[PDB]
PDB file of C-alpha atoms and ligand atoms in Angstrom:
ATOM      1  CA  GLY A   1     -14.843 -21.467  -0.082  1.00 48.38           C
ATOM      2  CA  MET A   2     -11.375 -19.767  -0.501  1.00 46.39           C
ATOM      3  CA  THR A   3     -11.617 -16.197   0.783  1.00 42.53           C
ATOM      4  CA  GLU A   4     -10.408 -13.422  -1.494  1.00 40.89           C
ATOM      5  CA  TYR A   5      -8.741 -10.214  -0.047  1.00 38.91           C
ATOM      6  CA  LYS A   6      -8.904  -7.122  -2.220  1.00 36.49           C
ATOM      7  CA  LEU A   7      -5.806  -4.928  -1.254  1.00 36.03           C
ATOM      8  CA  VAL A   8      -5.143  -1.472  -2.824  1.00 32.74           C
ATOM      9  CA  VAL A   9      -1.581  -0.120  -2.886  1.00 32.06           C
ATOM     10  CA  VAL A  10      -1.630   3.757  -2.692  1.00 27.69           C
ATOM     11  CA  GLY A  11       0.965   6.577  -2.390  1.00 27.23           C
ATOM     12  CA  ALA A  12       2.782   9.347  -4.259  1.00 28.45           C
ATOM     13  CA  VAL A  13       4.176   8.540  -7.701  1.00 24.17           C
ATOM     14  CA  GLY A  14       7.849   7.159  -7.439  1.00 26.90           C
ATOM     15  CA  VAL A  15       7.485   5.748  -3.850  1.00 30.77           C
ATOM     16  CA  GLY A  16       7.828   2.042  -5.093  1.00 31.77           C
ATOM     17  CA  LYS A  17       4.164   0.818  -5.196  1.00 32.40           C
ATOM     18  CA  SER A  18       4.791  -1.146  -8.421  1.00 32.78           C
ATOM     19  CA  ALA A  19       8.237  -2.445  -7.283  1.00 32.80           C
ATOM     20  CA  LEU A  20       6.703  -3.561  -3.950  1.00 29.93           C
ATOM     21  CA  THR A  21       3.783  -5.445  -5.684  1.00 31.89           C
ATOM     22  CA  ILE A  22       5.990  -7.157  -8.346  1.00 32.55           C
ATOM     23  CA  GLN A  23       8.418  -8.163  -5.521  1.00 33.66           C
ATOM     24  CA  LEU A  24       5.566  -9.904  -3.678  1.00 32.21           C
ATOM     25  CA  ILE A  25       4.077 -11.624  -6.821  1.00 28.39           C
ATOM     26  CA  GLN A  26       7.138 -12.374  -8.986  1.00 27.81           C
ATOM     27  CA  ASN A  27      10.029 -12.317  -6.362  1.00 25.47           C
ATOM     28  CA  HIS A  28      12.261  -9.882  -8.368  1.00 23.93           C
ATOM     29  CA  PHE A  29      13.153  -6.166  -8.302  1.00 21.53           C
ATOM     30  CA  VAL A  30      12.041  -4.338 -11.444  1.00 23.55           C
ATOM     31  CA  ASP A  31      13.996  -1.133 -11.742  1.00 22.86           C
ATOM     32  CA  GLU A  32      11.965   0.499 -14.680  1.00 21.33           C
ATOM     33  CA  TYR A  33       8.156   0.059 -14.578  1.00 24.11           C
ATOM     34  CA  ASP A  34       6.086   2.732 -16.400  1.00 23.46           C
ATOM     35  CA  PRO A  35       4.799   5.179 -13.694  1.00 22.27           C
ATOM     36  CA  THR A  36       1.371   5.620 -15.392  1.00 21.87           C
ATOM     37  CA  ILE A  37       0.354   1.968 -15.770  1.00 20.20           C
ATOM     38  CA  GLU A  38      -2.217   0.719 -13.177  1.00 21.46           C
ATOM     39  CA  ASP A  39      -2.596  -3.184 -12.998  1.00 22.60           C
ATOM     40  CA  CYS A  40      -4.058  -5.938 -10.838  1.00 21.89           C
ATOM     41  CA  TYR A  41      -2.212  -8.972  -9.507  1.00 17.73           C
ATOM     42  CA  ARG A  42      -3.308 -12.165  -7.841  1.00 14.67           C
ATOM     43  CA  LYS A  43      -1.489 -14.542  -5.582  1.00 13.00           C
ATOM     44  CA  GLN A  44      -2.746 -17.582  -3.640  1.00 11.11           C
ATOM     45  CA  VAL A  45      -1.029 -17.713  -0.234  1.00  9.48           C
ATOM     46  CA  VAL A  46      -1.259 -19.468   3.115  1.00 14.27           C
ATOM     47  CA  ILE A  47      -1.486 -16.980   6.156  1.00 16.85           C
ATOM     48  CA  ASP A  48      -1.743 -18.423   9.610  1.00 18.72           C
ATOM     49  CA  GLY A  49      -2.699 -21.836   8.269  1.00 17.69           C
ATOM     50  CA  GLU A  50      -5.414 -20.451   5.918  1.00 18.30           C
ATOM     51  CA  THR A  51      -5.326 -20.529   2.078  1.00 22.15           C
ATOM     52  CA  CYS A  52      -6.594 -17.316   0.582  1.00 22.47           C
ATOM     53  CA  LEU A  53      -6.295 -15.357  -2.625  1.00 27.23           C
ATOM     54  CA  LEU A  54      -4.802 -11.796  -2.587  1.00 26.58           C
ATOM     55  CA  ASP A  55      -6.274  -9.511  -5.331  1.00 30.70           C
ATOM     56  CA  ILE A  56      -3.928  -6.428  -5.382  1.00 30.98           C
ATOM     57  CA  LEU A  57      -4.491  -3.200  -7.221  1.00 33.17           C
ATOM     58  CA  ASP A  58      -1.173  -1.369  -7.853  1.00 33.98           C
ATOM     59  CA  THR A  59      -2.506   2.215  -8.296  1.00 34.56           C
ATOM     60  CA  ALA A  60      -1.167   4.738 -10.865  1.00 36.54           C
ATOM     61  CA  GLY A  61      -2.047   7.814 -12.912  1.00 36.04           C
ATOM     62  CA  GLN A  62      -3.605  11.172 -12.117  1.00 36.73           C
ATOM     63  CA  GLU A  63      -5.628  12.198  -9.108  1.00 30.54           C
ATOM     64  CA  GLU A  64      -9.352  11.740 -10.013  1.00 27.89           C
ATOM     65  CA  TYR A  65     -12.394  12.330  -7.688  1.00 32.82           C
ATOM     66  CA  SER A  66     -15.052  10.938 -10.066  1.00 29.42           C
ATOM     67  CA  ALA A  67     -18.073   8.876  -8.730  1.00 32.17           C
ATOM     68  CA  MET A  68     -16.608   5.900 -10.595  1.00 33.42           C
ATOM     69  CA  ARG A  69     -13.038   6.172  -9.251  1.00 33.13           C
ATOM     70  CA  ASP A  70     -14.526   6.540  -5.730  1.00 30.75           C
ATOM     71  CA  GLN A  71     -16.725   3.423  -6.299  1.00 30.90           C
ATOM     72  CA  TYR A  72     -13.785   1.388  -7.616  1.00 33.16           C
ATOM     73  CA  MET A  73     -11.580   2.233  -4.619  1.00 33.74           C
ATOM     74  CA  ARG A  74     -14.687   1.475  -2.412  1.00 31.11           C
ATOM     75  CA  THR A  75     -14.230  -2.188  -3.549  1.00 27.62           C
ATOM     76  CA  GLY A  76     -10.819  -2.317  -1.702  1.00 23.51           C
ATOM     77  CA  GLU A  77     -10.973  -4.033   1.724  1.00 22.11           C
ATOM     78  CA  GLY A  78      -7.461  -2.933   2.815  1.00 23.38           C
ATOM     79  CA  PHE A  79      -4.981  -0.308   1.908  1.00 25.52           C
ATOM     80  CA  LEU A  80      -1.249  -0.261   1.837  1.00 26.23           C
ATOM     81  CA  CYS A  81      -0.346   3.491   2.213  1.00 26.19           C
ATOM     82  CA  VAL A  82       3.236   3.716   0.911  1.00 27.12           C
ATOM     83  CA  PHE A  83       5.723   6.692   1.193  1.00 30.43           C
ATOM     84  CA  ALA A  84       9.614   6.670   0.513  1.00 32.83           C
ATOM     85  CA  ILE A  85      11.787   7.285   3.533  1.00 28.55           C
ATOM     86  CA  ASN A  86      14.017   9.618   1.344  1.00 29.68           C
ATOM     87  CA  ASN A  87      11.058  11.940   0.273  1.00 25.66           C
ATOM     88  CA  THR A  88       9.452  14.043   2.996  1.00 29.32           C
ATOM     89  CA  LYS A  89       6.545  15.122   0.780  1.00 32.71           C
ATOM     90  CA  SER A  90       5.481  11.454  -0.004  1.00 35.33           C
ATOM     91  CA  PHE A  91       5.249  11.076   3.880  1.00 38.64           C
ATOM     92  CA  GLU A  92       3.186  14.261   4.403  1.00 36.66           C
ATOM     93  CA  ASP A  93       0.924  13.080   1.431  1.00 37.25           C
ATOM     94  CA  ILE A  94      -0.073  10.107   3.578  1.00 36.76           C
ATOM     95  CA  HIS A  95      -2.524  12.357   5.465  1.00 37.08           C
ATOM     96  CA  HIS A  96      -4.389  13.010   2.142  1.00 40.13           C
ATOM     97  CA  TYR A  97      -4.496   9.325   1.060  1.00 38.98           C
ATOM     98  CA  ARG A  98      -5.829   8.216   4.543  1.00 38.52           C
ATOM     99  CA  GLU A  99      -8.655  10.978   4.410  1.00 35.79           C
ATOM    100  CA  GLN A 100      -9.603   9.843   0.847  1.00 36.29           C
ATOM    101  CA  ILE A 101      -9.848   6.169   2.034  1.00 36.15           C
ATOM    102  CA  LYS A 102     -11.842   7.279   5.140  1.00 36.78           C
ATOM    103  CA  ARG A 103     -14.217   9.306   2.886  1.00 36.86           C
ATOM    104  CA  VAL A 104     -14.998   6.652   0.283  1.00 38.28           C
ATOM    105  CA  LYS A 105     -15.201   3.747   2.806  1.00 37.55           C
ATOM    106  CA  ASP A 106     -17.253   6.031   5.228  1.00 36.86           C
ATOM    107  CA  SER A 107     -15.347   4.573   8.180  1.00 38.47           C
ATOM    108  CA  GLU A 108     -12.775   5.555  10.750  1.00 36.07           C
ATOM    109  CA  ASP A 109     -11.420   1.977  11.236  1.00 37.24           C
ATOM    110  CA  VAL A 110     -10.606   0.848   7.629  1.00 36.75           C
ATOM    111  CA  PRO A 111      -7.919  -1.934   7.448  1.00 33.57           C
ATOM    112  CA  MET A 112      -4.665  -0.079   6.635  1.00 36.84           C
ATOM    113  CA  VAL A 113      -0.921  -0.397   6.952  1.00 37.44           C
ATOM    114  CA  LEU A 114       1.669   2.464   6.770  1.00 38.46           C
ATOM    115  CA  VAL A 115       4.744   1.435   4.656  1.00 40.57           C
ATOM    116  CA  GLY A 116       8.065   3.297   4.615  1.00 40.58           C
ATOM    117  CA  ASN A 117       9.705   2.038   1.336  1.00 39.13           C
ATOM    118  CA  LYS A 118      13.275   2.236   0.137  1.00 38.83           C
ATOM    119  CA  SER A 119      14.711   1.475   3.650  1.00 39.67           C
ATOM    120  CA  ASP A 120      17.822   0.242   1.731  1.00 40.29           C
ATOM    121  CA  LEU A 121      18.714   3.847   0.888  1.00 37.77           C
ATOM    122  CA  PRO A 122      21.098   5.869   3.089  1.00 37.66           C
ATOM    123  CA  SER A 123      19.672   9.295   2.133  1.00 36.68           C
ATOM    124  CA  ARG A 124      16.911   9.031   4.793  1.00 32.19           C
ATOM    125  CA  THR A 125      14.811  12.203   5.280  1.00 36.23           C
ATOM    126  CA  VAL A 126      11.824  10.680   7.293  1.00 34.52           C
ATOM    127  CA  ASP A 127      12.669   9.558  10.932  1.00 33.36           C
ATOM    128  CA  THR A 128      11.280   5.923  11.702  1.00 35.11           C
ATOM    129  CA  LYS A 129       9.937   7.491  15.109  1.00 34.89           C
ATOM    130  CA  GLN A 130       8.034  10.158  13.209  1.00 34.74           C
ATOM    131  CA  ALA A 131       6.471   7.492  10.999  1.00 37.19           C
ATOM    132  CA  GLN A 132       5.789   5.181  14.070  1.00 36.74           C
ATOM    133  CA  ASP A 133       4.006   8.140  15.850  1.00 35.72           C
ATOM    134  CA  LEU A 134       1.781   8.936  12.747  1.00 34.38           C
ATOM    135  CA  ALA A 135       0.837   5.192  12.616  1.00 35.67           C
ATOM    136  CA  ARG A 136      -0.017   5.221  16.295  1.00 36.05           C
ATOM    137  CA  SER A 137      -2.246   8.248  15.899  1.00 36.06           C
ATOM    138  CA  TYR A 138      -4.105   6.463  13.122  1.00 35.37           C
ATOM    139  CA  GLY A 139      -4.173   3.155  15.172  1.00 36.10           C
ATOM    140  CA  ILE A 140      -2.446   1.043  12.464  1.00 36.11           C
ATOM    141  CA  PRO A 141       0.774  -1.047  11.905  1.00 33.42           C
ATOM    142  CA  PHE A 142       3.959   0.662  10.374  1.00 29.92           C
ATOM    143  CA  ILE A 143       6.245  -1.628   8.288  1.00 25.95           C
ATOM    144  CA  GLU A 144       9.551  -0.459   6.811  1.00 28.21           C
ATOM    145  CA  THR A 145      10.249  -2.069   3.448  1.00 29.11           C
ATOM    146  CA  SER A 146      12.673  -2.235   0.532  1.00 28.10           C
ATOM    147  CA  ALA A 147      11.413  -3.643  -2.668  1.00 28.99           C
ATOM    148  CA  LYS A 148      15.073  -3.807  -3.777  1.00 28.74           C
ATOM    149  CA  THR A 149      16.309  -6.221  -0.991  1.00 28.52           C
ATOM    150  CA  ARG A 150      12.746  -7.624  -0.198  1.00 29.17           C
ATOM    151  CA  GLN A 151      12.955  -6.369   3.497  1.00 28.68           C
ATOM    152  CA  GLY A 152       9.479  -6.370   5.037  1.00 27.84           C
ATOM    153  CA  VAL A 153       7.625  -7.076   1.698  1.00 30.30           C
ATOM    154  CA  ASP A 154       5.721 -10.269   2.664  1.00 32.36           C
ATOM    155  CA  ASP A 155       5.315  -8.723   6.109  1.00 32.32           C
ATOM    156  CA  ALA A 156       3.647  -5.501   4.759  1.00 32.14           C
ATOM    157  CA  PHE A 157       0.907  -7.421   2.738  1.00 33.80           C
ATOM    158  CA  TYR A 158       0.427 -10.281   5.220  1.00 34.19           C
ATOM    159  CA  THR A 159       0.061  -7.745   8.052  1.00 35.26           C
ATOM    160  CA  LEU A 160      -2.658  -5.922   5.974  1.00 37.73           C
ATOM    161  CA  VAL A 161      -4.432  -9.356   5.426  1.00 34.90           C
ATOM    162  CA  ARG A 162      -4.477  -9.879   9.196  1.00 33.94           C
ATOM    163  CA  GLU A 163      -5.933  -6.337   9.665  1.00 35.47           C
ATOM    164  CA  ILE A 164      -8.731  -7.208   7.269  1.00 34.73           C
ATOM    165  CA  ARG A 165      -9.406 -10.642   9.048  1.00 30.50           C
ATOM    166  CA  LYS A 166      -9.753  -8.949  12.520  1.00 29.31           C
ATOM    167  CA  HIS A 167     -11.989  -6.225  10.989  1.00 27.86           C
TER     168      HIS A 167
HETATM  169  N1  GDP B 201      16.522   1.790  -3.827  1.00 28.15           N
HETATM  170  C1  GDP B 201      15.309   1.572  -3.970  1.00 28.15           C
HETATM  171  N2  GDP B 201      14.635   1.928  -5.101  1.00 28.15           N
HETATM  172  C2  GDP B 201      13.327   1.566  -5.198  1.00 28.15           C
HETATM  173  C3  GDP B 201      12.598   0.872  -4.256  1.00 28.15           C
HETATM  174  N3  GDP B 201      11.321   0.659  -4.625  1.00 28.15           N
HETATM  175  C4  GDP B 201      11.244   1.303  -5.771  1.00 28.15           C
HETATM  176  N4  GDP B 201      12.384   1.831  -6.120  1.00 28.15           N
HETATM  177  C5  GDP B 201      12.676   2.594  -7.348  1.00 28.15           C
HETATM  178  O1  GDP B 201      11.915   3.814  -7.277  1.00 28.15           O
HETATM  179  C6  GDP B 201      11.414   4.172  -8.627  1.00 28.15           C
HETATM  180  C7  GDP B 201       9.918   4.130  -8.559  1.00 28.15           C
HETATM  181  O2  GDP B 201       9.400   2.885  -8.341  1.00 28.15           O
HETATM  182  P1  GDP B 201       7.946   2.475  -8.813  1.00 28.15           P
HETATM  183  O3  GDP B 201       7.646   1.134  -8.305  1.00 28.15           O
HETATM  184  O4  GDP B 201       7.842   2.788 -10.234  1.00 28.15           O
HETATM  185  O5  GDP B 201       7.064   3.574  -7.961  1.00 28.15           O
HETATM  186  P2  GDP B 201       5.482   3.857  -7.988  1.00 28.15           P
HETATM  187  O6  GDP B 201       5.294   5.114  -8.925  1.00 28.15           O
HETATM  188  O7  GDP B 201       5.022   4.132  -6.612  1.00 28.15           O
HETATM  189  O8  GDP B 201       4.840   2.608  -8.650  1.00 28.15           O
HETATM  190  C8  GDP B 201      12.017   3.157  -9.591  1.00 28.15           C
HETATM  191  O9  GDP B 201      13.255   3.533 -10.100  1.00 28.15           O
HETATM  192  C9  GDP B 201      12.268   1.929  -8.669  1.00 28.15           C
HETATM  193  O10 GDP B 201      13.322   1.068  -9.146  1.00 28.15           O
HETATM  194  C10 GDP B 201      13.303   0.397  -3.037  1.00 28.15           C
HETATM  195  O11 GDP B 201      12.825  -0.177  -2.103  1.00 28.15           O
HETATM  196  N5  GDP B 201      14.644   0.835  -3.006  1.00 28.15           N
HETATM  197  C1  LXU B 202      -6.326   6.448  -5.116  1.00 28.28           C
HETATM  198  C2  LXU B 202      -6.830   7.346  -4.009  1.00 28.28           C
HETATM  199  C3  LXU B 202      -6.075   8.634  -4.143  1.00 28.28           C
HETATM  200  N1  LXU B 202      -5.252   8.887  -5.120  1.00 28.28           N
HETATM  201  C4  LXU B 202      -4.825  10.236  -4.733  1.00 28.28           C
HETATM  202  C5  LXU B 202      -3.815  10.878  -5.599  1.00 28.28           C
HETATM  203  C6  LXU B 202      -3.347  12.101  -5.153  1.00 28.28           C
HETATM  204  C7  LXU B 202      -2.486  12.775  -5.938  1.00 28.28           C
HETATM  205  C8  LXU B 202      -1.965  12.215  -7.143  1.00 28.28           C
HETATM  206  N2  LXU B 202      -1.005  12.880  -7.814  1.00 28.28           N
HETATM  207  C9  LXU B 202      -2.427  10.983  -7.491  1.00 28.28           C
HETATM  208  C10 LXU B 202      -3.352  10.327  -6.702  1.00 28.28           C
HETATM  209  N3  LXU B 202      -5.322  10.600  -3.611  1.00 28.28           N
HETATM  210  O1  LXU B 202      -6.166   9.615  -3.265  1.00 28.28           O
HETATM  211  C11 LXU B 202      -6.598   6.814  -2.599  1.00 28.28           C
HETATM  212  C12 LXU B 202      -7.523   5.715  -2.256  1.00 28.28           C
HETATM  213  C13 LXU B 202      -8.977   6.329  -2.029  1.00 28.28           C
HETATM  214  C14 LXU B 202      -9.241   7.115  -3.256  1.00 28.28           C
HETATM  215  S1  LXU B 202     -10.797   7.590  -3.704  1.00 28.28           S
HETATM  216  C15 LXU B 202     -10.332   8.339  -5.134  1.00 28.28           C
HETATM  217  N4  LXU B 202     -11.187   8.916  -6.038  1.00 28.28           N
HETATM  218  C16 LXU B 202      -8.946   8.276  -5.216  1.00 28.28           C
HETATM  219  C17 LXU B 202      -8.180   8.928  -6.290  1.00 28.28           C
HETATM  220  N5  LXU B 202      -7.667   9.556  -7.060  1.00 28.28           N
HETATM  221  C18 LXU B 202      -8.312   7.659  -4.207  1.00 28.28           C
HETATM  222  S1  2XO B 203      -8.352  -5.141 -11.907  1.00 24.22           S
HETATM  223  C1  2XO B 203      -9.084  -6.159 -10.599  1.00 24.22           C
HETATM  224  C2  2XO B 203      -9.069  -5.508  -9.313  1.00 24.22           C
HETATM  225  N1  2XO B 203      -9.871  -4.485  -9.028  1.00 24.22           N
HETATM  226  C3  2XO B 203      -9.618  -4.205  -7.660  1.00 24.22           C
HETATM  227  C4  2XO B 203     -10.078  -3.183  -6.834  1.00 24.22           C
HETATM  228  C5  2XO B 203      -9.497  -3.170  -5.541  1.00 24.22           C
HETATM  229  C6  2XO B 203      -8.659  -4.114  -5.060  1.00 24.22           C
HETATM  230  C7  2XO B 203      -8.206  -5.075  -5.947  1.00 24.22           C
HETATM  231  C8  2XO B 203      -8.662  -5.140  -7.218  1.00 24.22           C
HETATM  232  N2  2XO B 203      -8.276  -5.897  -8.287  1.00 24.22           N
HETATM  233 MG1   MG B 204       3.761   2.201 -10.474  1.00 25.12          MG
END
């Protein structure tokens, strides 16, 4: 029976969650993609010699702490916590996203990967060392990515699948 992996891509609006997901599924960089549209994607892949189905939720829209929104995010098995390396607030917001995940999953060891997106941009404001240290404190991997060039994209999602398998 082919295993399905439910991944949820989270992070501040504009960090590149939609661009990262479309790059993984369709292998192209979409410049303009409505910031309010939330959608699901599927991709069958082989990871470490095992065929599996990725079911990815590309989150969007306003902040909502309803019983229903909490139960929907509770269905996620692994979370890609994305920030943009050229926006310090998106990086500081990561503390909030992790605490919300920890709260709804009622667990301190939820499969998760920290992702620094837009590594193609020269206007960096978040130091790789600062991100690596935050990831160490949480005990999770840190993958730098660029949805524009495809740097680290397969690596970000496949790393999250491996975190779920071990868990
Ligand atoms: N240079 C660069 N721009 C990116 C990258 N990823 C996303 N963008 C741009 O950042 C903006 C927001 O991307 P989007 O995927 O809509 O972000 P979301 O709100 O997190 O889904 C768009 O103009 C994208 O083209 C990246 O890795 N590099
Ligand atoms: C999706 C997510 C979340 N989104 C936000 C957020 C913050 C600010 C803005 N502007 C937009 C969204 N903070 O956490 C993370 C995963 C776990 C849960 S549980 C739940 N009810 C969530 C919601 N909403 C969440
Ligand atoms: S829209 C189908 C769907 N719902 C999800 C929740 C969490 C992770 C992936 C998902 N896909
Ligand atoms: Mg989006």
